[PDB]
Write a protein that holds these residues in place. Structure first.
Motif, PDB file in Angstrom:
ATOM      1  N   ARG A   1      -4.201   6.024 -12.903  1.00 14.14           N
ATOM      2  CA  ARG A   1      -3.021   6.572 -13.544  1.00 14.14           C
ATOM      3  C   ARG A   1      -3.334   7.272 -14.880  1.00 14.14           C
ATOM      4  NH1 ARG A   1       2.249   3.015 -12.767  1.00 14.14           N
ATOM      5  NH2 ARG A   1       3.222   4.991 -12.144  1.00 14.14           N
TER       6      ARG A   1
ATOM      7  N   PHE B   1      -7.342   8.340   1.317  1.00 15.85           N
ATOM      8  CA  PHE B   1      -6.482   8.196   0.122  1.00 15.85           C
ATOM      9  C   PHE B   1      -5.369   7.171   0.417  1.00 15.85           C
ATOM     10  CE2 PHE B   1      -2.238   9.144  -1.517  1.00 15.85           C
ATOM     11  CZ  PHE B   1      -2.393   8.761  -2.829  1.00 15.85           C
ATOM     12  N   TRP B   2      -4.723   7.347   1.578  1.00 14.90           N
ATOM     13  CA  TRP B   2      -3.629   6.553   2.117  1.00 14.90           C
ATOM     14  C   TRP B   2      -4.052   5.172   2.588  1.00 14.90           C
ATOM     15  CZ3 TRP B   2       0.940   8.357   0.937  1.00 14.90           C
ATOM     16  CH2 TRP B   2       1.057   9.717   0.640  1.00 14.90           C
ATOM     17  N   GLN B   3      -5.370   4.864   2.473  1.00 15.81           N
ATOM     18  CA  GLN B   3      -5.985   3.599   2.855  1.00 15.81           C
ATOM     19  C   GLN B   3      -5.619   3.223   4.293  1.00 15.81           C
ATOM     20  OE1 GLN B   3      -5.407   1.486  -1.468  1.00 15.81           O
ATOM     21  NE2 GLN B   3      -6.272   0.241   0.127  1.00 15.81           N
TER      22      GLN B   3
ATOM     23  N   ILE C   1       0.857  -1.198   0.000  1.00 16.93           N
ATOM     24  CA  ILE C   1       0.000   0.000   0.000  1.00 16.93           C
ATOM     25  C   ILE C   1       0.880   1.230   0.000  1.00 16.93           C
ATOM     26  CG2 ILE C   1      -1.758   1.444   1.160  1.00 16.93           C
ATOM     27  CD1 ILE C   1      -3.135  -1.487   1.881  1.00 16.93           C
TER      28      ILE C   1
ATOM     29  N   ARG D   1       3.042   1.924  -3.249  1.00  6.80           N
ATOM     30  CA  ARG D   1       2.122   2.300  -4.320  1.00  6.80           C
ATOM     31  C   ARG D   1       1.418   3.633  -4.090  1.00  6.80           C
ATOM     32  NH1 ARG D   1      -0.549  -3.735  -5.221  1.00  6.80           N
ATOM     33  NH2 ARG D   1       1.430  -4.884  -5.354  1.00  6.80           N
ATOM     34  N   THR D   2       0.946   3.929  -2.858  1.00  7.97           N
ATOM     35  CA  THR D   2       0.313   5.227  -2.566  1.00  7.97           C
ATOM     36  C   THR D   2       1.335   6.351  -2.687  1.00  7.97           C
ATOM     37  OG1 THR D   2       0.178   4.436  -0.276  1.00  7.97           O
ATOM     38  CG2 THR D   2      -1.887   4.901  -1.381  1.00  7.97           C
ATOM     39  N   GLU D   3       2.643   6.022  -2.521  1.00  2.62           N
ATOM     40  CA  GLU D   3       3.703   6.994  -2.726  1.00  2.62           C
ATOM     41  C   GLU D   3       3.820   7.265  -4.232  1.00  2.62           C
ATOM     42  OE1 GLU D   3       5.018   8.626   0.153  1.00  2.62           O
ATOM     43  OE2 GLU D   3       5.427   9.989  -1.532  1.00  2.62           O
ATOM     44  N   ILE D   4       3.824   6.194  -5.056  1.00  8.13           N
ATOM     45  CA  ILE D   4       3.883   6.310  -6.521  1.00  8.13           C
ATOM     46  C   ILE D   4       2.813   7.270  -7.030  1.00  8.13           C
ATOM     47  CG2 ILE D   4       3.335   5.020  -8.675  1.00  8.13           C
ATOM     48  CD1 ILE D   4       5.183   2.915  -6.564  1.00  8.13           C
TER      49      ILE D   4
ATOM     50  N   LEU E   1      -7.830  -3.275  -0.985  1.00  2.00           N
ATOM     51  CA  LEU E   1      -7.004  -2.895   0.156  1.00  2.00           C
ATOM     52  C   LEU E   1      -5.658  -3.537  -0.202  1.00  2.00           C
ATOM     53  CD1 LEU E   1      -6.824  -1.608   3.077  1.00  2.00           C
ATOM     54  CD2 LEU E   1      -7.363  -3.914   3.915  1.00  2.00           C
ATOM     55  N   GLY E   2      -4.890  -2.831  -1.013  1.00  2.00           N
ATOM     56  CA  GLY E   2      -3.651  -3.387  -1.516  1.00  2.00           C
ATOM     57  C   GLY E   2      -4.005  -4.465  -2.499  1.00  2.00           C
TER      58      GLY E   2
ATOM     59  N   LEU F   1      -4.583   0.085  -6.896  1.00  2.00           N
ATOM     60  CA  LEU F   1      -3.741   1.287  -6.779  1.00  2.00           C
ATOM     61  C   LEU F   1      -2.989   1.661  -8.050  1.00  2.00           C
ATOM     62  CD1 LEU F   1      -2.586   0.436  -3.248  1.00  2.00           C
ATOM     63  CD2 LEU F   1      -3.365   2.691  -3.773  1.00  2.00           C
ATOM     64  N   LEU F   2      -2.396   0.677  -8.747  1.00  2.00           N
ATOM     65  CA  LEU F   2      -1.640   0.910  -9.990  1.00  2.00           C
ATOM     66  C   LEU F   2      -2.476   0.880 -11.303  1.00  2.00           C
ATOM     67  CD1 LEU F   2       1.624  -1.103  -9.200  1.00  2.00           C
ATOM     68  CD2 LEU F   2       1.164   1.340  -8.751  1.00  2.00           C
TER      69      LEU F   2
END
Ligand SMILES: CCc1cc(C)[nH]c(=O)c1CN1CCc2c(Cl)cc(OC3CCN(C(=O)[C@@H](C)O)CC3)c(Cl)c2C1=O
Ligand SMILES: [Zn+2]
Ligand SMILES: [Zn+2]
Ligand SMILES: [Zn+2]
Ligand SMILES: [Zn+2]
Ligand SMILES: [Zn+2]
Ligand SMILES: [Zn+2]
Ligand SMILES: [Zn+2]
Lengths: 464, 359, 128
Positions: B120, B291-293, A41, A44-47, B234-235, B165-166
Motif C-alpha cells: 500500500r 496477482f489474484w492469488q 483474499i 482485499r485483492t479488490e481493495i 495466501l490470505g 495483502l493489506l
C-alpha cells in the motif's frame, strides 16, 4: 465380566472409529478454513485492484553493449549496456545484541486416550443384557503408553495468588516458595541472567485463606508483635491475631551449616575468598575484608587492587565505592567495571581488516576503557560453537575462568570490535567484581583521540 | 499454457530473479525485469510470443552478483522504479525513465536475499539478509524505519519474506528452519513509519532513531525439517517451502485461532495441506503466485515447471499442470505471473528465459 | 577527526553534524526488559500474582541499576513511589507484602522498611 480378546478388538474398533471421526472433522474444518480465507483474499485483492485503477504509472521505453539470443529462432537483439556507477561497501557484520553486563546461557495422545476410555466404558454400560478390564485392554494395544496400573492413575485427569478470589490456606514456605527460589540475592532480581544456581535455604533464613496464609508468614518475620501484625493484615486487630495464634575458579557462595570454612569448604578448595554472599560466620577468616583507603585504590597499597578485585560497595566504606550513586566519577578509582563507567568508542572499518573500534577521548596508561561483555558459556558449549566458528575464521571467545567463556559473537558491547595484535595498545584483565569474574579492557600505554584499539587475543585464549 | 518463446542473456550466469511490473496501466505493454550476474535487464511482452529487449544495466563492480529485484513507483512523478540487490549487500534504486541509479543503501552486514515493497505504501522497502536480519527502509525520506532481528530474530541467514495483502504484517523465513511473524501495524511500528516521513536531516544534527525489533509476534521451527527458502501469504494462511519437495500450507496457532489474536507465546501450528512435486531438493528455488492469488507456480532443478490452481478447496485435490519443454533442462530459480496471469516467465541457471502463454 | 564513523546499531554513517556521538549503548537495552518479563511468564508453577510483582520489581532494578545491599532499603521505597499506582490498580498488594518479607528473609531490607513501604502504599490508595 467380558472376554480379554473381545475387549482388545473393541479397543482397535473404537480407536479406528474415533481416529476416523476426528480426521473427518479436521477434513471439513480445513475445507471451511480455505473458503472463509478465499473471501478474505477477494475482499482485499479488490481493495488493491481499486487503489491501482486510480494510478496512471508511466511506461518503460527502449535504451559497451549486450545481446539476447533466442533458441525458438526469434531475431537476435542488441542493446547498449549502461554502467551503474560504483558504490562503496562496508565490511561484513552479522546480527548481534548489545550487552552492558554478561548473559548466562545453558548448554496415542491424552485427548484421544480419554475419549477412547469413555467410548469403551459406553460399551461396558451397554453390556447389561471406569472398569479395570478397559485399562488392561488399552494397555495391551498401546503397551508403550504404560501398564493398566499406569493408565489407571493417568486417567484420573502452583499455589493460588493471595490477591486472587481462590486464595487457599497453606504454610509460610508455600506462600513464599516462588519468591524464595526465584530471587537472586547477588543481583536483586527474579530469574536473573547471570546466576544459575538457586539460593541455598540459609540465604532466605534471617478467617479467609488470604488472611490465614498471611498470618503464618508474618509470624515468621514479626513474632509476638501482634499489635504490628494487625497493622499489616489491616482487616484484623491484635485481639483477633492473638486468638488465631493459640488455635582460576568461579565463585559460588558456600553453605556448610554448623561447619567452618576449612579444607572441606568449596570456597577454600577453589582457592577463593568467601564473599558477603556466603552463609558462613561473620567472623569467617576466609572472607575478604575490603579496603580502608581514603581514596584512589589503584596501587598494591590497596588490598582490593592487590587481590585483583574491584572494591565492594558493602565493605569499602571509606574509599568512595559505597557512595554517590548518581555520579560515575568518584573518589575510588577501583570500581569502574561495576558502575559501568566505560569510555566513548567509535565504530569504523579497521585500518587492518574488517571493522575496528576507535577511542573518542584520550586515555592514560592502565586507565579502564571498557568491559568485554558477552554470553557466559560452558567450556563444552564453547567447543560445540567453535566447530561452526572455525568455518568462518572466527574466535570471539575469551576465557573468563576454568569454568566459563565469554562469547561476544551473538551479543556483547562495542569493545567486541577491538582487533587482535601481538603489538597491542590495550590489555585484558579478568577481575573479581562483587562475586563475579569480569573481563576489563585497560590501556597498555597512553592513547590519544581517534586511535584504533587492539588487544592480544592469545592472552585471553590460554587456560593452559 | 504454451511455451511461446525462450531467450538467452549473453553473461551465461544463473538468473536468480524475475519480476513483472504490476504497476503498468491497463493498455500498457507487459514489462518484466531479470537479475543475474552483475546485470539488470528489462523486457517488453508482445503478441505471438515476441519478447523485446528494452534496457540493460551493469554494476561497475565485477564481483557484484544480483539475487533479487522489486518494482515500485514515485508517488509524486508516476515513474516506475526497480530496486535490486545481491551478494554485496547493497540496494540500488533504478529509474528506467531517467535511466539512472537514483538511490542506494549500504547498511546490511551481508548479502540481500530478498527485496519486497509494501503493498500500500510505495516508499516502504523490506530487505532480507544473510546477516540474519530484515530491514524496513523509507526510500522517500532515505531512512531506516526498523531492523527486524536480534535476541529472538533469525539465528541464521534470512532467505525470504512477504507482506500480507493489506501490509499489516511480514512473515520471514531462513536457514535456521524458522518462520517468524513481524506485525507492522503495532503502535510502535506505525509511530516509527510516521516519524520516518517527518525526519528532515536539514532541520536537525541528530540521526534518525531506527526501531530495533528483537522479538517476533510468532515463531515456529515445526513446519519444515531443513532451511526454508520461500514464504508467501495466501490470505491469512501461510505457504512455505524447504528442500523436501513440498509447498506446505499451514497457519499459526490451532485450527480456529484468528491470526490477529495469536500471542507471541503461541506454541501451536496447524497444517492445512501440501502441494507435492519432485526434483527440487536444491536451495534458493522460489515459487510465485498470480496477482489474484488463484495460481501458484514453481520450477525444478531439471527444468519442469509446476502450476497449481489454488481456487480448489483441499490442496491434495489441487489441479496441477506440468509445463515441460524438451530444450528446457536447467534449474528454474524463479517464476513470475503477468498481473492478468496471461503470461508466466521462468528464469534458469543457464541464463535462459522461458515464456509460457495462457490459453 | 577526518575519519568516517558508523552507528554500531545500524552501520549507517555519521554526519559531520552528529560530532562523533554513537550512544545506543544505554544501561538497560530495551530487549533485556522484554526478555525478563517474557521469561517470568514462561513459568508454569508460578501464579499470575507473584509473576506481575517479579516483573515489575526487575524492571525497577534494571532501570536504576542497584549494585549494593546498602541500596536495597531505598530500592523498596523508590519502587513503592514509582510503581505504587500500578501495584494498587492491578490488585497485587498482598503479593507485594510477600515480596517485602522475601527481601527481609534474604537480609537485604530492615523491618522498619517492610512497614514504611506498606504505610506508603495505603497513603497512595487513599489518594483514590
Ligand atoms: C565481533 C564481530 C567483529 C569483530 C571485529 C574485531 N571485527 C569485525 O569485523 C567483526 C565483524 N565480524 C567479522 C566477520 C564475521 C563472520 Cl565471517 C562470521 C561471524 O559469525 C558467524 C556467523 C554464522 N554463525 C551462525 O551461527 C549461523 C550460521 O547461524 C556463526 C557465527 C561474525 Cl559474528 C562476523 C562479524 O560480525
Ligand atoms: Zn544473579
Ligand atoms: Zn565455606
Ligand atoms: Zn564462602
Ligand atoms: Zn566462610
Ligand atoms: Zn580507594
Ligand atoms: Zn576496596
Ligand atoms: Zn576503593
Amino acid at each position: 465380566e467380558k472376554g480379554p480378546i473381545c475387549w482388545r478388538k473393541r479397543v482397535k474398533s473404537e480407536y479406528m472409529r474415533l481416529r476416523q471421526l476426528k480426521r473427518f472433522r479436521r477434513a471439513d474444518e480445513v475445507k471451511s478454513m480455505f473458503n472463509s480465507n478465499r473471501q478474505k483474499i477477494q475482499e482485499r485483492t479488490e481493495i488493491l485492484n481499486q487503489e491501482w485503477k486510480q494510478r496512471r504509472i508511466q511506461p518503460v521505453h527502449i535504451m559497451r553493449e549486450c545481446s539476447v539470443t533466442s533458441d525458438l529462432d526469434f531475431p537476435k537483439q542488441v542493446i547498449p549496456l549502461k554502467t551503474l556507477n560504483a558504490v562503496a561497501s562496508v565490511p561484513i557484520m552479522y546480527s548481534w545484541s548489545p550487552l552492558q553486563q554478561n548473559f548466562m546461557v545453558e548448554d496415542i495422545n491424552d485427548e484421544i486416550f480419554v475419549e477412547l476410555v469413555n467410548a469403551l466404558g459406553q460399551l461396558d454400560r451397554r453390556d447389561e443384557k471406569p472398569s479395570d478390564k478397559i485399562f488392561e485392554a488399552i494397555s495391551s494395544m498401546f503397551p508403550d503408553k504404560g501398564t493398566a496400573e499406569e493408565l489407571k492413575e493417568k486417567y484420573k485427569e502452583c499455589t493460588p495468588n493471595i490477591d486472587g478470589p481462590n486464595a487457599k490456606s497453606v504454610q509460610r514456605e508455600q506462600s513464599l516458595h516462588s519468591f524464595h527460589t526465584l530471587f537472586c540475592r547477588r543481583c536483586f532480581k527474579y530469574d536473573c541472567f547471570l546466576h544459575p544456581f538457586h539460593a541455598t535455604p540459609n540465604t532466605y533464613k534471617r478467617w479467609s485463606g488470604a488472611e490465614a496464609s498471611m498470618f503464618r508468614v508474618l509470624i515468621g518475620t514479626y513474632y509476638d508483635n501482634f499489635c504490628a501484625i494487625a497493622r499489616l493484615i489491616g482487616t484484623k486487630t491484635c485481639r483477633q491475631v492473638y486468638e488465631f495464634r493459640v488455635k582460576v575458579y568461579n565463585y559460588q557462595p558456600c553453605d556448610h551449616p554448623r561447619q567452618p570454612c576449612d579444607n572441606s569448604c568449596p570456597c577454600v578448595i577453589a582457592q577463593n575468598f568467601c564473599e558477603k554472599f556466603c552463609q558462613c560466620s561473620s567472623e569467617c577468616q576466609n572472607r575478604f575484608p575490603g579496603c580502608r583507603c581514603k581514596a584512589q585504590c589503584n596501587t598494591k597499597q590497596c588490598p582490593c587492587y592487590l587481590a585483583v578485585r574491584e572494591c565492594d560497595p558493602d565493605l569499602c566504606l571509606t574509599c568512595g565505592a559505597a557512595d554517590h550513586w548518581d555520579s560515575k566519577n568518584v573518589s575510588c578509582k577501583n570500581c569502574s567495571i561495576q558502575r559501568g563507567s566505560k569510555k566513548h568508542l567509535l565504530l569504523a572499518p579497521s585500518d587492518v581488516a574488517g571493522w575496528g573500534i576507535f577511542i573518542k577521548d584520550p586515555v592514560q596508561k592502565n586507565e579502564f576503557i571498557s568491559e568485554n561483555c558477552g554470553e557466559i558459556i560452558s567450556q563444552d558449549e564453547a567447543d560445540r560453537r567453535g566447530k561452526v566458528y572455525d568455518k568462518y575464521m572466527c574466535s570471539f571467545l575469551f576465557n573468563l575462568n576454568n569454568d566459563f567463556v565469554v562469547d561476544a559473537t551473538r551479543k556483547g558491547n562495542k569493545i567486541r570490535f577491538a582487533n587482535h595484535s601481538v603489538n597491542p595498545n590495550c590489555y585484558a584483565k579478568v577481575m573479581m567484581v562483587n562475586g563475579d569474574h569480569r573481563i576489563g579492557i585497560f590501556a597498555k600505554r597512553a592513547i590519544q583521540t581517534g586511535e584504533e584499539l587492539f588487544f592480544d587475543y592469545r592472552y585471553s585464549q590460554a587456560d593452559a | 499454457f504454451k511455451c511461446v518463446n525462450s531467450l538467452k542473456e549473453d553473461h551465461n550466469q544463473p538468473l536468480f530473479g524475475v519480476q513483472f511490473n504490476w504497476h503498468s496501466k491497463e493498455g500498457d505493454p507487459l514489462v518484466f525485469a531479470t537479475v543475474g550476474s552483475n546485470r539488470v535487464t528489462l523486457y517488453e511482452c508482445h503478441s505471438q510470443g515476441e519478447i523485446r529487449l528494452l534496457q540493460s544495466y551493469v554494476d561497475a563492480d565485477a564481483d557484484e552478483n544480483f539475487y533479487t529485484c522489486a518494482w515500485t513507483y514515485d508517488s509524486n512523478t508516476s515513474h516506475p522504479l526497480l530496486a535490486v540487490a545481491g551478494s554485496r549487500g547493497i540496494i540500488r534504486i533504478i529509474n528506467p525513465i531517467t535511466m539512472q541509479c537514483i538511490k542506494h543503501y549500504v547498511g546490511h552486514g551481508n548479502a540481500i536475499n530478498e527485496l519486497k515493497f509494501h503493498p500500500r505504501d510505495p516508499n516502504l522497502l523490506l530487505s532480507v539478509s544473510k546477516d540474519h536480519a530484515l530491514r524496513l527502509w523509507n526510500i522517500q525520506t532515505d531512512t531506516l524505519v526498523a531492523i527486524f532481528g536480534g535476541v529472538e530474530g533469525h539465528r541464521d541467514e534470512v532467505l525470504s519474506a512477504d507482506y500480507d495483502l493489506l501490509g499489516e504484517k511480514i512473515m520471514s523465513c531462513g536457514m535456521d528452519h524458522s518462520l517468524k511473524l513481524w506485525r507492522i501495524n503495532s503502535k510502535r511500528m506505525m509511530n516509527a513509519i510516521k516519524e520516518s516521513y517527518d525526519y528532515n536531516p536539514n532541520k536537525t544534527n541528530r540521526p534518525f532513531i531506527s526501531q530495533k525489533i528483537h522479538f517476533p509476534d510468532f515463531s515456529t521451527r515445526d513446519i519444515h525439517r531443513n532451511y526454508v527458502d520461500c514464504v508467501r501469504w495466501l490470505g491469512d494462511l501461510i505457504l512455505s517451502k524447504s528442500c523436501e519437495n513440498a509447498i506446505v500450507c499451514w497457519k499459526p496457532g490451532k485450527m480456529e485461532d484468528d491470526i490477529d489474536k495469536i500471542k507471541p507465546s503461541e506454541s501451536n501450528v496447524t497444517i492445512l495441506g501440501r502441494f507435492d512435486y519432485s526434483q527440487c531438493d536444491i536451495w534458493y528455488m522460489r515459487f510465485s503466485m498470480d496477482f489474484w492469488q488463484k495460481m501458484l507456480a514453481l520450477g525444478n532443478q531439471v527444468g519442469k515447471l509446476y502450476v497449481w490452481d489454488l481456487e480448489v478447496e483441499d490442496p491434495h485435490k489441487a489441479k496441477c499442470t506440468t509445463l515441460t519443454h524438451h530444450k528446457c533442462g536447467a534449474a528454474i530459480r524463479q517464476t513470475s505471473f503477468s498481473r492478468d496471469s496471461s503470461i508466466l516467465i521462468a528464469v534458469c541457471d543457464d541464463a535462459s528465459i522461458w515464456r509460457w502463454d495462457r490459453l | 577527526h577526518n575519519r568516517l564513523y558508523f552507528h554500531s546499531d545500524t552501520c549507517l554513517p555519521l554526519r559531520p553534524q552528529e560530532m562523533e556521538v554513537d550512544d545506543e549503548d544505554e544501561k538497560d537495552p530495551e530487549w533485556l526488559r522484554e526478555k525478563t518479563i517474557t521469561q517470568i511468564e514462561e513459568f508454569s508453577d508460578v501464579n499470575e500474582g507473584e509473576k506481575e510483582v517479579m516483573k515489575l520489581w526487575n524492571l525497577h532494578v534494571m532501570k536504576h541499576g542497584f549494585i549494593a545491599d546498602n541500596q536495597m532499603n531505598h530500592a523498596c521505597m523508590l519502587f513503592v513511589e514509582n510503581y505504587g499506582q500500578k501495584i494498587i490498580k492491578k490488585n497485587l498488594c498482598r503479593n507485594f507484602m510477600l515480596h517485602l518479607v522475601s527481601m527481609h528473609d534474604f537480609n537485604l531490607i530492615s523491618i522498619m522498611s517492610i512497614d514504611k513501604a506498606v504505610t506508603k502504599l495505603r497513603e497512595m490508595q487513599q489518594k483514590l
